[PDB]
Each structure stands twice: as C-alpha cells, then as structure tokens.
C-alpha cells in the first residue's frame, strides 16, 4: 500500500539492478567512481516502482576509532551510510525517510554505532531521528602518515549509538577517527 | 549434500545468533579461546549457516575490511576486502563436507561484493584452500595501527590466503610483497 525499502546485500544484486542503482544515484547526486565503490560491500535499501528504482541507500562496515580521557582506545564496529538518493521527480513523499528506516534497521541489528556525514542543511531531520551531531574534530588513520585531521567544513558527522562496549561512555566533543580508503574518507 | 544459508547479521534472530556464538566458541575450543573480540570480528556481514535437527552444525562469516597493498609503481591500494571469520564445524559432524558447503556460501558473497577475499588458516588447513583456488601470501603480513605505524605480524602460526575476484583494472598482485590489514581491536587477522 505504501512504499518501503527492501534490504539486499551487494552480493545478491544482479548486474541489471546493480547498474541501475549506480546510474540512479549518479543522476540524483548529479558522484565519482570512488563514491560508488564506497557504497558496495554491505546492505542496500532499494525502493522500486513502475519498472525503475526510485530511492536507494547503503550501509557498509567500517571501523571508528575513539580514545577517551581513559586512554583506552576503541575500534567500534560501524555501519556507515552511503549513497542515499531519491529520484528527482519523486521527492517530497517520504521516500528518503523510508530508506533511512531500513538502513537504521541494519545498523541496529549488526553494528555498534551508525555514522554518516551530512550538510548543515540536513541536521534537523537526522537529529529528530535520534542521531547525534559530532562536535569534536574528525580525522582519518592514513597508511602513509598517521592520523590526519579532516579539513573543517559545513559538513557534519552524525553517529547513532546502538551497542557500545562495556562502559565506553562517549564524549562527542573528543576526537573521532575513521579508517582509510581512497577518495572521500567520509 | 548439505547447503548453507546466507544471512546478514542484522537479519539474525536472537535464537539463531546465540547458538552461532555458542557453536563457534565450542568449535574453536582447541592459539587462544574464542574471546569477546573474536566474536565481534565475526559480526557485521554475511553468515553462512548449516543446521540439522534444529541445531547449528556449521558456521562461517565474511565481513568487510580494507587490505592495503603497494605495487612497485608506488601504488597505494586500499582494497575492498571480504574477510573470512569464524569458520566452525561441530566436532561430531566433521568429515561430511560441511566446511566445503560453508566456503561455497562464503565465496559467493566474496565474488559478488568485494575486490578480494582474505582469510587466515593453519598449516593443516592450507591444502583445503589451495585446492579451492586460494592464493597463499608469501610476503610479510602487517597491521596498520593508530599509535605505531605499520607493524609486522609474524608471531602467528597461521597463513594468509587471498581470493582475487574484482581487482582494480590495472592491478596484478605480487604475493611476494607486503600486505597490510586495517586496524581493529584484538586479533587483526
């Protein structure tokens, strides 16, 4: 009766669906070859209608590194949101929130923390769904060098705490560090 | 002829999940005992399950990480890797090909989703994977740490194996070079 996203792992997509998702996200964002590679390897939220894909999103597995005053140091098992895109003539109908619904399901069931990167324009809705704005600096653990701070911008990082270890507590004003990949680390 | 079912961690119900952690800890109770981190590493991607009489008799998982590799031309590849974890067969059910069935499922997930598969196996296991088409890494293995740099991991009786399935178009692997996994807490391989 009402559009919902169905969850499919990358390895269960056939190439005609796989090619449609890449083509659709590229038209909805404009998104390079790397931005699409960052979206492969985990769970896809797909909404299809009238022969075509109308909305898309992905959650892939990374590590988020966090060290508190303790000095302990944690590598959290992270569900990272990628390639959320609603067909242009299909917006304003809640298809976006139906993709986030299915992605958060994945996060809550398989990961210790959700994370995504969003612009100032989009903070209101993410906050309303329970995500937290990360205020502290962000960085990346590079292979060549070590930890390298991510250049400051109007993009914000958001995290969804779901199943953190023993205590961990979590100070969102402290530093947080993602793992390395080429292209955009976030 | 047993076949494995492929289930994502999130689709795992509490029953099916606690049994899997139970079967794997008992199966790997021969090194070190299955720690909390060993199980955490096995969570997050696709599980291959085989069950019988309602009980779980075989398990494996493949989870996504990055493998860092640098060719002679300077390179710099952070390959999208399906890493194999928690391959366990119930002790009384070994011999009937259950492990085969598990890897059958796990290789489908690899070939369908990642640029390379990787696993760590004991010397006694080597033959089973080589006959399946896996390449043995001869080069030194290492791990990228947040505090130190890239540190070698040789104090291990295990051998690294890789399954190239969708390498970036220029890449041809020299299994003689160094290979570096991404950082995680606990056993990095």
Author numbering:
A (entry chain B): 14 to 43, 55 to 210
B (entry chain A): 15 to 44, 52 to 210
Source paper text:
The asymmetric unit of the apo-AAC(2′)-Id structure comprises a dimer of dimers. The final model of apo-AAC(2′)-Id contains 742 amino acid residues (dimer of dimer, subunit A: 191 residues, subunit B: 180 residues, subunit C: 184 residues, subunit D: 187 residues), whereby the N-terminal loop region (residues 1–14) and the 45–51 loop region are commonly missing due to weak electron density in all subunit structures. The monomer structure of apo-AAC(2′)-Id has one long β-sheet surrounded by four α-helices. The dimerization of apo-AAC(2′)-Id is achieved by interactions among β1, α2–β2 loop, β3, β4, α3, β7–β8 loop, and β10. Moreover, the dimerization of apo-AAC(2′)-Id was confirmed in solution via analytical ultracentrifugation. Structural comparison between the apo- and the substrate-CoA-bound AAC(2′)-Id structures revealed significant conformational differences in the α1–α2 loop, α4-helix, and β8–β9 loop region between the structures. The α1–α2 loop is the most flexible region in the structure of AAC(2′)-Id and thus misses some residues. This loop may move and cover the substrate-binding site in the apo-structure, whereas it exhibits a more open conformation in the substrate-bound AAC(2′)-Id structures. In the apo-AAC(2′)-Id structure, Arg179 forms a salt bridge with Asp208 and Asp177, as well as hydrogen bonds with the carbonyl oxygen atom of Trp210. The salt bridge, however, is lost in all substrate-bound structures as Arg179 flips away from Asp208 and Asp177.
